[PDB]
Design a binder for this molecule. Structure first.
Ligand code: 4GZ
Ligand code: 4GZ
Lengths: 244, 244
């Protein structure tokens, strides 16, 4: 159905095996629901030593991605993608990814993800080749590959058939606690409601737990929500119990 | 020197090749600055079909990590780590990772990272086995492996010898623009200051650019900082120019 194609520009394409060969995403690739295609700037070099880095104007330590091999790799990916491919640059300077952002990105049938190494890429390439800049969080990594892989995994969950944070009606809340066998573990028992077989009591317990957990751990997330009448009631109950 | 050991619990240990075999982190592993050791709950199963999932109490769709194989894997990792290993569970319900959090985690000589699959792990395991809960961002992935890999990469940058977001004195600000060859690219020129050879003008330009970029893209980050006199001045200059 709404299958997705993701082009990747990376000096380390074999890193992407972590998502293309394993788990739910691996199955998505095998079943042709998701296609990940990689281009390596090293393949676009022409000097004997296949140089992919270059010195920064203005000095300072560190190197940057060499423009020519990276530019040529991007152009080749764009040509293969055809029309409509959104080109994304992953860096801490980008729009912070959240679940709403994931759902926006998942609307695209084609994406090209540019993964930098070293200290960065030329600002003029960002101006001329990149459509959107995204960050997976406020921290610094050794390359854009893990961020790209994270984005791919997050959007892959929205492709029909692949499956069986933020935005019942619990979208926007933290997940509730989960329990499986055994009934008693290190003296700790499963909440009896979960054994009751009472589907409505269980639903309300889970929703109440999610509201309580969000209130205690991430109260700022609650402010972004328009709680339903039921959610307002269950949250009040949790707060009263917490205060008791 | 201050080398780091990271134990990992994962159903897909081969995913970790993405960080142990490539780039800066790959070199860190080869040079014994970083050691990543994996235990797979599947190896701790005893039934013919090596079952690693189990049904949730209370019903609902989805499965959870089976308790016994996961618990046994964790205990084995803890025994190997010896004393002082901090056990971390990666999920959206955890403390949000940022660069300050990375620096806190990097203080640990040993970490054990628990990577879940399916819909989660038993809440009582979180109570009894986990020291800290961390999230790499407000989005949902298919497993805890990419978050674990992200954390490892982020902390690896702090191990001496491995190298040559948030918290001069530019810590806390977004990165400045970078330029490399050629001097003119698609009609776009490198800022002349970067060619001036004037080290102090270049330093101030970069700092001003970082202040401007942080103000325009992430103004909330500026509020968390106590700007130096120089930073206050350069920010004012950037704001005046933006308003002109
Ligand atoms: C605030 C600050 C201060 C100092 C340097 C930087 C900086 O941007 N350094 C360059 C890092 C680099 C790759 N590493 C990444 C990529 C993406 C993400 C993410 N959070 O999505 C994290 N780290 C280099 C290759 C191009 C992309 C960026 C940022
Ligand atoms: C808000 C919300 C709503 C609904 C479900 C969940 C949920 O937690 N679902 C389970 C996901 C799972 C793995 N996926 C991950 C792991 C870590 C991260 C991260 N951001 O660090 C992201 N995704 C399952 C295995 C155990 C760990 C958690 C969360």
């Amino acid at each position: 159905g709404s299958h997705m194609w993701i082009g990747v520009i990376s000096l380390f394409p074999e890193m992407f095996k972590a998502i293309t060969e394993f788990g739910v995403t691996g199955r998505a690739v095998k079943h042709n629901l998701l296609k990940v295609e990689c281009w390596n700037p090293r393949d676009f070099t022409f000097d004997k030593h296949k140089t992919v880095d270059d010195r920064p104007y203005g000095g300072g330590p560190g190197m940057l991605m060499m423009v020519q091999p990276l530019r040529d790799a991007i152009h080749t990916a764009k040509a293969a993608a055809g029309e409509g491919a959104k080109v994304i640059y992953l860096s801490p300077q980008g729009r912070k990814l959240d679940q709403g952002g994931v759902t926006e990105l998942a609307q695209n049938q084609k994406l090209i993800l540019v993964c930098g190494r070293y200290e960065g890429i030329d600002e003029r390439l960002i101006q001329t080749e990149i459509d959107e800049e995204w960050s997976i969080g406020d921290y610094v990594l050794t390359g854009g590959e893990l961020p790209a892989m994270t984005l791919i995994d997050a959007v892959a969950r929205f492709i029909p058939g692949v499956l069986g944070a933020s935005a019942s009606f619990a979208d926007g809340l933290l997940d509730c606690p989960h329990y499986t066998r055994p009934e008693v573990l290190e003296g700790l028992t499963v909440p009896p409601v979960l054994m009751s077989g009472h589907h409505e009591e269980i639903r309300k317990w889970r929703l109440k737990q999610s509201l309580q957990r969000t209130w205690l751990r991430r109260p700022e997330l609650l402010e972004g929500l328009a709680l339903t009448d039921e959610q307002r009631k269950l949250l009040k109950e949790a707060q009263a119990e917490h205060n008791s």
